[PDB]
Design a binder for this molecule. Sequence first.
Ligand SMILES: O[C@@H]1[C@@H](O)[C@H](O[C@@H]2CO[C@@H](O)[C@H](O)[C@H]2O)OC[C@H]1O
Ligand SMILES: O[C@@H]1[C@@H](O)[C@@H](O)OC[C@H]1O
Ligand code: NA
Ligand code: NA
Ligand code: NA
Length: 134
Amino acid sequence: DLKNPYERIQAEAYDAMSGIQTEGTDDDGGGDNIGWINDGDWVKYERVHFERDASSIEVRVASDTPGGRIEIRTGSPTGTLLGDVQVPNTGGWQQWQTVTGNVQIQPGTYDVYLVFKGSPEYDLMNVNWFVFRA
Ligand SMILES: O[C@@H]1[C@@H](O)[C@H](O[C@@H]2CO[C@@H](O)[C@H](O)[C@H]2O)OC[C@H]1O
Ligand SMILES: O[C@@H]1[C@@H](O)[C@@H](O)OC[C@H]1O
Ligand code: NA
Ligand code: NA
Ligand code: NA
C-alpha cells in the first residue's frame, strides 16, 4: 500500500479529491485522466514513500484553456508548498504534453496533494500521471 514516487503515479488513482472527475484518455497508452479541474481543486495520494530526496516532478497534462499551475503540498491541501508546475495551453483537452517543475522533498512517507490553481473563470487542465525525479 505504499506508493512509489519514482515511477509514474496515475492521476486517477487518488485516495481523496475535491472538485474533479475522471474520463478515458486519448493519450498514448490509453487509460484515464482526471479533469474538470478548477482553481482550488485537489487530489490526494496517500502513503507516498520517498527513499531519497526528490528535486523535480514531471506531469503529463493537457488543456484547451490558458492553463494554470499545480502546487505540490503534503499533509493537507494547505500544507507547505514543496514545488509547483506551470501548465500551459496545449491545444486541446486531449493534446498531451509533459511539463516539469522543481520540488524539494526529503526522504519520508507523505500524503501528497496536487492543488490546482488559476483563473476561477474556466476549467484549467487535465492530468494523466506524474512522476518525481531525484
Ligand atoms: O477536463 C475537461 C473538462 O474541463 C471539459 O469541460 C469543458 C470546460 O470548458 C468549457 O469551455 C467547456 O464547455 C466544457 O465542456 O470537458 C472535457 C474534459 O476533458
Ligand atoms: O498529439 C497527441 C494527441 O493526439 C494525444 O494522443 O496526446 C498525445 C499527443 O502527442
Ligand atoms: Na472542478
Ligand atoms: Na515551479
Ligand atoms: Na492516467
